Design a protein around this ligand. Structure first.
Ligand code: AQD
Ligand code: OLA
Ligand code: OLA
Ligand code: OLA
Ligand code: OLA
Ligand code: OLA
Ligand code: OLA
Ligand code: OLA
Ligand code: OLA
Ligand code: OLA
Length: 373
């Protein structure tokens, strides 16, 4: 009993603190405001809701040796929430894989600034779907001194719908996505990184230049780097002929054109004007260039490194739970030691504390936002 209490309090504390720190960090920091991180916030919410609505009465139950002394309707409420929040977590890991696959497979360019908010819409769908899976639990599925899902048909249904069916689908999509990105990565990575650096560095030289000569020299180096980068063809388009190739180079053509206009200004000694033109180059790079540079240099694939770790931890933490529960539901005679049933439940809930740690260790932006304690 004391161990359930101690472990339980620590668990609830860790989930609340870790996941709130994630939510607030995506809130405070512009560098964490990305499409992927919308889902990460959603997952954090699921874990916060778990710590607030489910874990306390779960811990209380465990201190009372598994006994349930409260009403059966409250039990039904708790179990529906339990099922929904577990399902929401999984469906959101699924949604990330669907979102990232579409981002990689379907390059889009918008006229208007900003995102489409399609991630928000997908996240909303994810939660409604999870509620749909969980909804029958609220209507009362049990035949009573314990709080368990006794309906064997329902348990098989949800085990399949919430876990054994989405997990293979999500693993296939993550795999296609990573393979998809690899195809965009140029062989001569270091050369393109050099070009990218020459661009970003000299933009900074231009901002703090003392005179027109320095601005002109920097612009000249940018021009050279832009033209070099324009020749770095990803393997995806290497088998293409001079359509697709028109899209790729066109961005660099706009950039060089703007650099040329800026050079004329710098050459005439119009430093202020040349500097303002260099700032408009920053926006062009963001529009037609920067997203594709990060893809073709291998940076976007690198930034996705944290996702397999999150998925891996989830599978590690929840696979025993679902194997135990579907086995029981399929085969009453397949007697699982109550002690093990309890163990795999704790392991499932411990996952809700792990993700903040995983981000901090395995994702650069979260890690850097952390490291400035
Ligand atoms: C997403 N699919 C499921 C999820 C479940 O729990 C997360 C369960 C489940 O059986 N949960 C039981 C029911 C109650 N829960 C522990 C608990 C929570 C709150 C108060 C007391 C006990 C247990 C882990 C079953 C399914 Cl099919
Ligand atoms: C059951 C625990 C271990 C299973 C973890 C599952 C990992 C989910 C992600 C799968 C996609 C492949 C990820 C492998 C590293 C990236 C590959 C690459 O860079 O091309
Ligand atoms: C790729 C499959 C991952 C399987 C699930 C991983 C579970 C996550 C648990 C956290 C362990 C953290 C310790 C790792 C330290 C090494 C980090 C590093 O080398 O960069
Ligand atoms: C600001 C990041 C959002 C998450 C906040 C942190 C949540 C709890 C994590 C802290 C536990 C730290 C465990 C040690 C790993 C960090 C070490 C490192 O930075 O490399
Ligand atoms: C961060 C700390 C949270 C991680 C610790 C959680 C696991 C505690 C497990 C305690 C075992 C409870 C025994 C159950 C019982 O006796 O009925
Ligand atoms: C009850 C259901 C609770 C639903 C919680 C869902 C909200 C998470 C979605 C919010 C998106 C975060 C945006 C941050 C970002 O831009 O990266
Ligand atoms: C979003 C991710 C979904 C991943 C695929 C998993 C399948 C879950 C299907 C849920 C269907 C249950 C609906 C219940 C009903 O209307 O009767
Ligand atoms: C699970 C849901 C899977 C959704 C995947 C659909 C992506 C279809 C990809 C079509 C690529 C368009 C780009 C093109 O062909 O020119
Ligand atoms: C996606 C993660 C990996 C999944 C692991 C494999 C899942 C296996 C789960 C089901 C095994 C339970 C079946 C045992 C009783 C079956 C009754 C019978 O044989 O008639
Ligand atoms: C990595 C973190 C590892 C997580 C370990 C948590 C699970 C251990 C729970 C021990 C089993 C106690 C419940 C059995 C019982 O008393 O009924």
């Amino acid at each position: 009993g004391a161990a359930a209490l101690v472990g339980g309090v620590l668990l609830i504390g860790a989930v609340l603190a870790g996941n709130s720190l994630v939510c607030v960090s995506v809130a405070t920091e512009r560098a964490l405001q990305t499409p992927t991180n919308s889902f990460i916030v959603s997952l954090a919410a699921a874990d916060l809701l778990l710590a607030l609505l489910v874990l306390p009465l779960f811990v209380y139950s465990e201190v009372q040796g598994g006994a349930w002394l409260l009403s059966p309707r409250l039990c039904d409420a708790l179990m529906a929430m339990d099922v929904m929040l577990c399902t929401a977590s999984i469906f959101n890991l699924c949604a990330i894989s669907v979102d990232r696959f579409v981002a990689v497979a379907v390059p889009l360019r918008y006229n208007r600034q900003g995102g489409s908010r399609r991630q928000l819409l997908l996240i909303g769908a994810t939660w409604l779907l999870s509620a749909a899976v969980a909804a029958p639990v609220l209507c009362g599925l049990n035949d009573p001194a314990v709080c368990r899902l006794e309906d064997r048909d329902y348990v098989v249904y949800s085990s399949v719908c919430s876990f054994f069916l989405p997990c293979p689908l999500m693993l296939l999509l993550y795999w296609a996505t990573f393979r998809g990105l690899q195809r965009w990565e140029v062989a001569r990575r270091a050369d393109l990184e050099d070009n990218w650096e020459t661009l970003n560095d000299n933009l900074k030289v231009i901002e703090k230049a003392d005179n027109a000569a320095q601005v002109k020299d920097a612009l000249t180096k940018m021009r050279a780097a832009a033209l070099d980068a324009q020749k770095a063809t990803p393997p995806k388009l290497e088998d293409k002929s001079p359509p697709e190739m028109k899209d790729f180079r066109h961005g660099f053509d706009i950039l060089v054109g703007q650099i040329d206009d800026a050079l004329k200004l710098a050459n005439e000694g119009k430093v202020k004007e040349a500097q303002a033109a260099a700032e408009q180059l920053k926006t062009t790079r963001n529009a037609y260039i920067q997203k594709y540079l990060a893809k073709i240099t291998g940076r976007e694939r690198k930034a996705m490194r944290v996702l397999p770790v999150v998925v891996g931890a989830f599978l590690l933490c929840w696979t025993p739970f679902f194997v135990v529960h579907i086995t029981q539901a399929l085969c009453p005679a397949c007697s699982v030691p109550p002690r093990l049933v309890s163990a795999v439940t704790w392991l499932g809930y411990v996952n809700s504390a792990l993700n903040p740690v995983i981000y901090t260790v395995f994702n650069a932006e979260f890690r850097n936002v952390f490291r400035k304690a």
